[PDB]
Symmetry: D2
Subunit: 481 residues, 4 copies
């Protein structure tokens, strides 16, 4: 075995060490070719045909770039080939746990199908990784290339999911703490995963990426912070970091949370729920699993991909008729109709436990307007989106360490006010989208009146088109005009 070269449109020619090739050439990894990165986003942005596979290669490549760069600048860190390979493998493998249509599956479907469970793609990645290693005899190959499976497997998993519980990590000691900041940065979110998806998603979406990760890599250094060795950024690059999160937020606003992409994800989720009793996936020892239970057996999960969509769409079984009809309405573009968007005001924050009650509230509103139809709770969908800088209300740049050119080994902190007054005052907000499942002209007119009335009753912000869609409703609220 020798090194392979892969040509990636985003990063160019990437070299893969033979051990990485071995990990990649397994059913568990190759599975990612059949999972769209952006789920339902492809149904709005036709360039977004890309899958988790190629993103994982990129993440693995960049993880290697950063660890190599640090080793070259700072030989005193004693970064070994072994460390590099482990960081690359964690990079390659942090997406292994994704399900059909990526975030649709763990963000919408599993929470509704198995409310009692607490599941994340991160956890799934660790489980799939263990399955990949054991099913394919990778441990001996790791030993052949100088890795120590016991410690290094633990390291790799910790890089993906955090401590499997004071230094809380066992795979490496504090003197190598900075290695835990590369693939999945739990401290402030600044990691190579973002860097790849910014660049790759932009390339495919047809929207231009504003963040320069190559620059960041050039200016990164390791310094001592509170008895840990951590990655620090050059002081003057702080603005670029603020911009990185701004870019992330723009991408969510323009693409990842696109109102129609989301309703498509929602429709697909509904079809999966209606199919979940009837689709069987064979796992370990021939045992049969459902879409919602395949997460319990990695052998079954290996075979759970976007393919399920087409299996349902092309099914002839009358049991799958309701699920199949939903997908067919997607194809004919008879989608649930977007009614509008609003936001909470002041300190008001909508809790997850209240999401189910919201359609009922909308249907209970009593707009003083003449209506041909009356709508019921089940006619409304309410989608609540939490937008933030990756740390709820917290500013991630408060959790970043910097260095200055006159003392490159001395770590410092930079506050928001030392950067600019043009920065956000808050770092989190919620958007509420409302859609109507009845798509005829009269139902939609009515849905608009209910929605705007509900916004007024709850003291939410005025929808942007409120005066046009509900001219009889908006004047009651002085605050709006």
């Amino acid at each position: 075995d020798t090194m392979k070269v892969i040509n990636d449109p985003i990063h160019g020619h990437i070299e893969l060490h033979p051990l990485l090739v071995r990990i990649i050439d397994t059913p568990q990894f190759q599975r990612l070719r059949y999972i769209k990165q952006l789920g339902g986003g492809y149904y709005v942005f036709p360039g977004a045909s890309h899958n988790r596979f190629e993103h994982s290669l990129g993440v693995g490549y960049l993880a290697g770039c950063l660890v190599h760069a640090l080793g070259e600048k700072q030989p005193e860190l004693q970064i070994s080939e072994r460390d590099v390979l482990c960081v690359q493998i964690a990079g390659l493998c942090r997406n292994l746990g994704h399900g059909p249509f990526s975030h649709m599956f763990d963000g919408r479907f599993i929470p509704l199908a198995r409310p009692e469970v607490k599941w994340t793609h991160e956890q799934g990645s660790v489980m799939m990784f263990e399955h990949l290693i054991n099913s394919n005899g990778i441990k001996p190959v790791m030993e052949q290339y100088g890795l120590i499976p016991e410690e290094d497997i633990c390291f790799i998993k910790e890089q993906i999911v955090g401590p499997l519980e004071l230094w809380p990590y066992k795979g490496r000691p504090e003197n190598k703490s900075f290695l835990y900041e590369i693939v999945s940065n739990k401290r402030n979110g600044i990691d190579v995963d973002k860097w790849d998806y910014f660049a790759r998603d932009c390339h495919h979406l047809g929207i231009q990426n504003n963040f320069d990760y190559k620059r960041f890599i050039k200016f990164a250094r390791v310094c001592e912070v509170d008895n840990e060795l951590r990655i620090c950024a050059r002081d003057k690059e702080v603005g670029n970091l603020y911009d990185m999160f701004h870019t992330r937020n723009s991408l969510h606003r323009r693409a990842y949370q696109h109102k129609v992409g989301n309703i498509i994800d929602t429709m697909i989720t509904d079809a999966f729920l209606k199919a979940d009793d009837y689709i069987e996936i064979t796992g370990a020892g021939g045992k049969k699993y459902r879409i919602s239970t395949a997460i319990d057996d990695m052998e079954a999960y290996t075979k759970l991909t976007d393919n399920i969509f087409l299996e349902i769409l092309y099914s002839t079984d009358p049991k799958l008729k309701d699920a199949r009809e939903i997908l067919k309405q997607i194809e004919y573009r008879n989608l649930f109709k977007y009614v509008g968007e609003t936001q909470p005001t002041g300190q008001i924050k909508i809790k997850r436990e209240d999401y189910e009650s919201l359609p009922k509230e909308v249907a209970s509103a009593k707009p003083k307007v003449l209506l041909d139809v009356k709508l019921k709770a089940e006619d409304f969908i309410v989608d609540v989106i939490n937008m933030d800088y990756g740390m709820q209300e917290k500013n991630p740049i408060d959790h970043v360490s910097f260095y200055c050119k006159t003392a490159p080994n001395r770590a410092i902190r930079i506050t928001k006010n030392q950067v600019s007054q043009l920065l956000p005052e808050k770092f989190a907000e919620q958007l509420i989208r409302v859609y109507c499942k009845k798509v005829d002209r009269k139902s939609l007119y009515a849905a608009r009146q209910y929605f705007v009335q509900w916004c007024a009753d709850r003291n939410f912000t005025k929808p942007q088109d409120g005066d046009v869609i509900a001219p009889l409703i908006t004047p009651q609220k002085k605050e709006w005009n």
Copy 2:
């Protein structure tokens, strides 16, 4: 209904007329989302996740751009909105007949599964188009927007597949002849289909595109040629056109005929053949079809996409065991091994009827070298590739008309010698690739000796690495050294 905007990474924001939206939002068209543009190419170029869907949008867009541009420069042509819509629809729909993995299906699978049939994606496109129109009530909508279904449906089909047999077309008269040169140019191959795939494939492959279609559109004009109105290019742009075909050939050499992408297509084709008896696809009136017969019923063909690959891979049926094993070997990257490449010499041309005899010839060669194993015909795959400028031995630029700035309405011809002596002397050639199905070190060593010996016996060109892979064989042939 009003016009929709779609954002495409290649062309930007494309406007779609409501009638086009209606055609697009049907199962027949949306199907193209599940068919990879480059088939097995994705297994070599991980950026090439793109599907026929987005390519079709682009072709439809560019077709519109060119016809609009000509109408704006030359009002005297009397190009109508009706003409524009018809050309856009033909652009959109010329890929409707593609099967799983695009060219794999009509280039390898159908020829082996149904040798008696003569099938092409072009023919399939016309059938799928008719099916799309009839199944979805499109005719009334066409009338609503000023089209005349009888004439215009004929025009659209003729644009895709040529005369459905003097002027041989019925959908438009000779004064609109130039319209037939936009979507699928049967005269010289210069059409909007190439322009989109050059740009889109390059974007995804990570290889840079050298052809500027926007420039070409700016310099295009309609002039009278032999009592037809044809599209002419500005004289000085002739070099750019030679370059366009050079680019096409480079793309085939680097990507579309990549030796490993082709062997993956071949392995997938073999799995399909082994599954063909057992997969059933439901068509019109509940009748059941096979992969190879789905082409006879468009209702069934609608459901025949890349999904078949995963249906086989994930199958548990013991009947599908052999097919499923082939695909699994793809996942583990245990692929048939490439042995080498050579070309015929002089006037020698390999005929299609002789393709089957070639593995037998290779196995019959008697290299004077010590071999642990003897290989048989069934161990060898011989792939013959015809590379040309789109017209067999003919130079397509001999079939292009030009105009000069001093007389923009007078069409002229330009010969190769009026352009450059650095151009090709021939416009067609054949490549022969040999692979071995036995992948162990000793079988591959042997396969190399047989292959090189066969090249020598047939007086084919010396493989580039011949002296390295078969040092005992190459010296016998004086011609090589």
Copy 3:
């Protein structure tokens, strides 16, 4: 004369009407080839070799695109070919008044050389335009293509500089008000000039552009607002507009106000001041002008370009020795040294009349630290930069009109709170940079102590590296720590 095509790396093949060609092919316009778009920026960003010439072509092109797009969507506006040409010409000609090194000349040099004068490149553009027309016999050519010089020349000038003083414009009536929003938008700054520079500067700088003007053009419409016809943007595009200004601010932070690019501009300005007595530029009737007075005669101003830099650098005249030495220090990269950056706190705002007093304040600070050298006012440079969203403290999106899909003719307003809580709370700030003209190690150490002490005394923000450069100074200030 017929239309010319130009190939631009940003916009592709641009078509130029013959009248535009005639305007372009004059000494007054071609001058712009010898004036760098980014001035001293090229000395930091080596890709920024681009000149005002090519930017002007782009602005003229985009101005045409927008006016054409609006006319095609809304024929009822009665936009004429004449209107289009006039808007294109204003676009082409709004940069004609730039001087050597663009903003350096009217932003730094003229204010210091001729404090009594009030001069702007805008004013210069109008003067140069009039000169161009009269010197080159353009009026007859304009009449030949259907323009009415009296009204249209007025219109063009008004588009550049605003009313040459109710409806305050004379070149077009209120029903064509929207035309005044294309080239130089005095209401909110959203114009084609920005669009071209964002794209072109980014292409040359090596920083990626986040704003999509093509999208914006597609969604733009004209609606009635307060008895004027104005350009409106689609409601949901409001986020993209906020982002456009954010992008502009990032470009200023990263590139246009780069600390070293600015000090280079400052050094060049100083050399020009020292040369201003001795360089003579011949204007109308052989009369001689200086660099600072060439603005009074357009014939002389025509010959005032970046060339002055080299004329000084290559001079042998002993009178120009001091000016020439400054430029030589640029070449050897012996630049004034950047000491640091800080900002005012609270309501504090530095007025233009106080800029001269600032070096003196820095030199008067009394840091309690042992210093080998004492520095004087003349050793310090203080550069005060006003950063905003183009309207001082005002939010430009408050001055934008929108429309919604359900009523495309009805203009509406959108507030900040209807968009996001992640937006800036303020839209303007000031940055203060300090540099030292003594570049030796001991002077620079001292300069750092003075600077930080001055920040503390004035209650400015703590410099980011303050604790490292002045550890003995920073602890006195509790606010900092």
Copy 4:
């Protein structure tokens, strides 16, 4: 001093070793900021504002990339940091000898002004380099970083211009022969200089680059060939190399030899010739030089840049009136008129000594057509362009060595016939362009008749528009029709 980072739009963030920074920050190098890469090309392609400075940085960067890559793959080569720095410096400095408007100066001007001299930019680069080193105290700095000035300066110069005289080089021995193939490859032309200009020129021209140098670097290796260690390319990459030269030839056809860019270069050259007696450039010890003699004194040559154009344009001296008028006609776009293009036939090859006789031949032709004016030799310009693959009639790929994956240390040769029959049969040709200095309609009509008659008399190829521009002349020649 520590390493600097520069952001280049083509290569990204490039790191510069402190010694390189010192070389760059001198008047001799910074000079290159005032010399356009493409000369008169900017007057046709307005994006091509780029200068030799930024190209030199890129060449220096890529030279470092390649030497680093080879050292990392093959530690047994013993490539030292010293070797790397020397190769970078040669890359940085191989453009130091370019004159105003780059190839215009050594390709047109010097050959006409100083026919007796044999001058090339290469020679100029060595002289400027020596001047740079000596004038700026660089030798000590080189010693400080481990270079040995005697040997290393010799090595650097040899890399630029070849042996200054079996192994003909003194700066390194045969075991380091491969180092001489990086910056300026005298064997086959495949070097980092091309790679940068392909990418950078394309970026600025608005034409897309087809060659992937990063790929080439990844597949490059050093192997023993005829008792030298040389750079070898992977066998299968041979097609990409053919394509690289095809790309180079396309760029010449489309841009570098653009008919109008060339006539502008010719006009500028004529102005320089007319100014050469009167412009004085001050060199060593105050001595005065002319444009054509500044090459004899590097102090003077340091000050000879594109500035000369503007010095002439802006001059008031009546002696410079004729030169100044030529440049003014450029600004008004009153250029010499292109008449047509043709090529020699068969074995016919035009020698340099016959270039001067060609205008006379054109004027002596006797077209049997009625002409209002008779034209003289001095009215015609004949531009003869030799287009090739960099080695006259020779195929450079015959001078490239390859390796195969099965024996990476064994160098091999590949012939054209082992690659493709679609490759050129010849590797050199000549183009003849004719222009007329009389631009009125009747002169140009007449010029066309003379030109086509001359083509017919000389048995050159038929101009593409021949039948249109000279319908009475073309029928006499049966060969044409």
